[PDB]
Fold:
Amino acid sequence: PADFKLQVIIIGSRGVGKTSLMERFTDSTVGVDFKIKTVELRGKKIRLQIWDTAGQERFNSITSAYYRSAKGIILVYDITKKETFDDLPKWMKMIDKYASEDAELLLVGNKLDCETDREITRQQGEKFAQQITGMRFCEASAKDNFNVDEIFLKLVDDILKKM
Ligand SMILES: Nc1nc2c(ncn2[C@@H]2O[C@H](COP(=O)(O)OP(=O)(O)O)[C@@H](O)[C@H]2O)c(=O)[nH]1
Ligand SMILES: [Ca+2]
Ligand SMILES: [Mg+2]
Structure:
């Protein structure tokens, strides 16, 4: 049996790869889906519930409920679509309103495989995360399976440390 059950949520604007990231890592209720994954991490069995939320603003009200329960939040943008990076303050406002104060946060620049179409630099993503105390950052590619395990596993590691 599992040592821990944890909920994490994936948020961000539409088309950034939130569903692709969740499905690459793993395999009705309005505005949300979820996958369950049992991970082994530092000898601990963790039953992970990953909520995948709607991206459009009209769904903020529904999805807000799932923020409070989240022990970790993955906020995703698309490195090739600058407006998904420009939306991040809106997502940070959603976090301030609804997340737990103790929620762990991770910023992800997804679509690293599309490096030639890059609109946002790595420094931009790093500097954004750095402004938010405790927020981790990395770039990933759901398509190329780069940093996919790592965004979930690192976030889980951060969560477990702080309990
Ligand atoms: N090239 C590339 N395309 C991606 C990546 N991740 C997602 N996509 C594509 O982006 C589009 C939207 O992704 P989706 O998972 O539905 O985004 P969501 O709205 O955030 O759930 C789809 O065409 C995906 O195949 C990636 O890492 N690289
Ligand atoms: Ca990996
Ligand atoms: Mg989706």
